[PDB]
Amino acid sequence: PHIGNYRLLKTIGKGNFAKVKLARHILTGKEVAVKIIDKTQLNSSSLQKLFREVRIMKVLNHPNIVKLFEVIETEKTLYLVMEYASGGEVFDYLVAHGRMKEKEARAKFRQIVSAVQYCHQKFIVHRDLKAENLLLDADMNIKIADFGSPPYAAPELFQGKKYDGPEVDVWSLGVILYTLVSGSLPFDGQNLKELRERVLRGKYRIPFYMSTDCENLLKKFLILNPSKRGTLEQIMKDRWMNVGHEDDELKPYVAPLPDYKDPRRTELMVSMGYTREEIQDSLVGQRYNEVMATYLLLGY
C-alpha cells in the first residue's frame, strides 16, 4: 500500500485510535513510522488531544525526541510520519536486562532531562511521562515519543490540586530515575488506594546498592510540595547528573540555527519538480507538507 510517498511495510502497533506502520519514504529510501488515525472514530476530547499533539510535534526539534517529518490530512484520516525508534521501550529493556548500573542510567537520564527541559523552555509540559514514552533508537539513545500511568502521578493528583505546571514533569522524572536504577517503582500498590497512600507519604525504599549521590538527586525530584520542586535547569547542575562529565556539565539544549537553503538537497528537490520558492515557503512556514518532509528526509 501507498499513501503519499510512502510504501507501508508492516504494522508495528495497533490500538483503537491508530495503527502504526513501519514505512519506507520512496524518494529517499528512508525508513519512517507512520501513525494512521481514523478521525471518524474519535470523540471530541480525543480530537482536542490529537490537534494539540500535532502542534507540539511540529515545534520540537531535539535529538532525543521523536522527530516529525510529515502531516497528511484528509477529512477522515490523519497520518503522522515520524522518526522510527527501532530499539524498543526503556520499559521492556528494564524487564529484560534488570536495573541499569548508575553509569548507564546516567547516560539515558541525561538525554531524558535534556529533552524534557527543552520542552519546558518552550512552555510545553508533557504531564503524562512514563516508561512507555521512553523509546530507544538503534544506538540506544533515548527518543521520547507520544505527546502504567498511576505510578508516575505527582501527589497533587490525589489531593485534588491543580495538575498543570512543569513541576508535574519534575516529579515523574524522579520516578523514572528510580525505576532506571532499581528496575522497580518507588510507589506501588495492589490497588489505587494503596498507591495513593504511598505517593502522598512520599517515602520510597532506598535499594542497598544505590549511591548517596543518586539518592540525593531523587530528593530533588520527589518533593511533595509542588511549589518547592526545582526547575530542570537547576537540577541539571546536580552532582550525579555530571559524574564522568567534568568537561561538559549538562546544560539546557540549544537547537542549531535553521538551515533551509542547503544547495545539495535543494538541487535534488528541483529535479523532483519542486520549486526553490515552495521549498523555502514550506520550511519557513514549518508546513510539514510533502516538500518539507522530503527536505528533512534528504538530511539523512
From Swiss-Prot:
In this UniProt entry, the residues modified to Phosphothreonine are T11, T212, T231
Where does this one sit in the cell? Cell membrane; Lateral cell membrane; Cytoplasm, Cytoskeleton; Cytoplasm
Superkingdom, natural source: Eukaryota
User: Residue limits of the UBA domain?
Assistant: 260-299
Q: Please tell me, according to the UniProt entry, what happens when changing S149A.
A: Loss of activity; neither activated by TAOK1 nor by STK11/LKB1
In UniProt terms, what function does this protein have? Serine/threonine-protein kinase. Involved in cell polarity and microtubule dynamics regulation. Phosphorylates CRTC2/TORC2, DCX, HDAC7, KIF13B, MAP2, MAP4 and RAB11FIP2. Phosphorylates the microtubule-associated protein MAPT/TAU. Plays a key role in cell polarity by phosphorylating the microtubule-associated proteins MAP2, MAP4 and MAPT/TAU at KXGS motifs, causing detachment from microtubules, and their disassembly. Regulates epithelial cell polarity by phosphorylating RAB11FIP2.
Instruction: Indicate the quaternary assembly.
Output: Homodimer. Interacts with MTCL1; the interaction is direct and increases MARK2 microtubule-binding ability. Interacts with PAK5; leading to inhibit the protein kinase activity. Interacts with MAPT/TAU. Interacts with YWHAB, YWHAG and YWHAQ.
* Protein name in the entry: Serine/threonine-protein kinase MARK2
Q: Gene name on record?
A: Mark2
